[PDB]
Curated annotation (Swiss-Prot):
Binding site residues for O2: H163, Q172
Segment of the intact protein contained: 23 to 269 of 344
Native species: Hypocrea jecorina (strain QM6a) (Trichoderma reesei)
Sugar-bearing residue positions: N59, N137
The organism's place on the tree of life at top rank: Eukaryota
Protein name, UniProt field: AA9 family lytic polysaccharide monooxygenase cel61A
Amino acid sequence: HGHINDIVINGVWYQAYDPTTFPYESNPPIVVGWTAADLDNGFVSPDAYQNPDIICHKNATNAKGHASVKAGDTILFQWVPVPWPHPGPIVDYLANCNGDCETVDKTTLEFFKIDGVGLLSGGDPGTWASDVLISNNNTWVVKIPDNLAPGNYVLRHEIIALHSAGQANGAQNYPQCFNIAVSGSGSLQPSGVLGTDLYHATDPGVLINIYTSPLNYIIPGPTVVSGLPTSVAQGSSAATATASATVP
Ligand SMILES: *[C@@H]1O[C@H](CO)[C@@H](O)[C@H](O)[C@H]1NC(C)=O
Ligand SMILES: *[C@@H]1O[C@H](CO)[C@@H](O)[C@H](O)[C@H]1NC(C)=O
Ligand SMILES: *[C@H]1O[C@H](CO)[C@@H](O)[C@H](O)[C@@H]1O
Ligand SMILES: *[C@H]1O[C@H](CO)[C@@H](O)[C@H](O)[C@@H]1O
Ligand SMILES: *[C@H]1O[C@H](CO)[C@@H](O)[C@H](O)[C@@H]1O
Ligand SMILES: *[C@H]1O[C@H](CO)[C@@H](O)[C@H](O)[C@@H]1O
Ligand SMILES: *[C@H]1O[C@H](CO)[C@@H](O)[C@H](O)[C@@H]1O
Ligand SMILES: *[C@H]1O[C@H](CO)[C@@H](O)[C@H](O)[C@@H]1O
Ligand SMILES: *[C@H]1O[C@H](CO)[C@@H](O)[C@H](O)[C@@H]1O
Ligand SMILES: *[C@H]1O[C@H](CO)[C@@H](O)[C@H](O)[C@@H]1O
Ligand SMILES: *[C@H]1O[C@H](CO)[C@@H](O)[C@H](O)[C@@H]1O
Ligand SMILES: *[C@H]1O[C@H](CO)[C@@H](O)[C@H](O)[C@@H]1O
Ligand SMILES: *[C@H]1O[C@H](CO)[C@@H](O)[C@H](O)[C@@H]1O
Ligand SMILES: *[C@H]1O[C@H](CO)[C@@H](O)[C@H](O)[C@@H]1O
Ligand SMILES: *[C@H]1O[C@H](CO)[C@@H](O)[C@H](O)[C@@H]1O
Ligand SMILES: *[C@H]1O[C@H](CO)[C@@H](O)[C@H](O)[C@@H]1O
Ligand SMILES: *[C@H]1O[C@H](CO)[C@@H](O)[C@H](O)[C@@H]1O
Ligand SMILES: [Cu+2]
């Protein structure tokens, strides 16, 4: 259980949606993260994998601003509270908004996977991507590909928690969506998958007992785009400056 407090984009700190705070305000601010109803720091379950809640989390509605980024930039996600409590994989996706992300229909988004890290070693439980996040003060770093075509995209970052995933409907997904506007010179526009088609409750990386050894793990969802590393070098770094979500 947790949520993202902020993202840091080449040293530039942006406030994220805070579902434990903003819904208690009369006039919450416009931020880069989607509005969502995880006030309990909770999860989407496999029984909602074919429901809109899996796309950007519970009842999510569009962020009303966006963070402008350069293709090749890295983005750091900051989870709270410290420490993230569960074993599981970590994955990131982009979807072209074919227009402003502030107004895109989330059910139309076609997501392509730009990273994914799963079981790094061992078993029962073994070492996972989430352990790397925990070690890096609850952060994860994703690189925006150098050659991504300029455009507006939703960045969908997600932790999957597998501690209870031996039972049907046991896996816990924690998607968090952000609006970015990408500038660059490249033309890469990869083929994507609808949010409600990414995952199925019987997938071998969703219905799985991690408390066994030896253990192998197939990360759920589509392949990482050819040519991209499945992760860039992880490691936390401080912000040097602060920005606000840019409104259209
Ligand atoms: C999400 O929306 C539905 C429909 O309005 C509502 O009944 C539900 O309580 C909302 N979920 C949360 C956790 O607020
Ligand atoms: C670790 O992350 C939390 C959440 O951003 C923050 O309160 C804390 O100061 C961070 N630790 C350091 C050493 O910055
Ligand atoms: C510190 O370094 C990290 C690692 O790439 C960035 O994501 C962050 O925005 C800051 O530059
Ligand atoms: C491109 O590839 C993806 C699979 O990653 C499909 O979902 C899409 O329809 C197209 O074939
Ligand atoms: C995933 O499921 C949703 C329904 O919630 C559809 O809109 C979508 O096209 C896909 O089948
Ligand atoms: C797990 O297996 C079921 C078959 O009963 C599939 O429908 C699902 O897509 C997943 O592969
Ligand atoms: C639990 O399951 C793993 C496979 O997931 C086996 O390799 C192990 O021997 C144990 O039966
Ligand atoms: C889990 O435990 C088994 C026990 O044989 C190991 O072989 C495996 O490599 C993992 O550590
Ligand atoms: C992941 O990679 C495979 C093979 O390169 C593609 O078929 C898929 O669409 C995705 O880009
Ligand atoms: C996947 O596809 C891209 C383009 O062909 C290659 O760059 C990569 O090495 C892998 O074949
Ligand atoms: C992403 O996944 C690839 C292939 O599974 C690993 O080789 C890489 O180190 C990273 O974990
Ligand atoms: C991306 O990050 C993972 C997790 O640290 C590494 O295992 C991988 O080699 C790459 O650095
Ligand atoms: C990752 O951790 C470092 C401390 O190692 C912080 O400076 C950074 O803000 C992030 O929390
Ligand atoms: C904080 O400060 C550093 C150095 O001036 C920048 O690289 C970063 O983008 C932010 O302005
Ligand atoms: C701009 O301001 C934010 C919060 O006001 C800090 O988190 C950041 O380090 C930067 O100084
Ligand atoms: C940019 O605008 C945002 C949204 O009002 C503020 O929260 C931020 O401090 C800066 O004024
Ligand atoms: C939104 O985008 C504007 C540029 O259009 C930036 O100046 C701002 O910092 C935020 O990324
Ligand atoms: Cu939890």
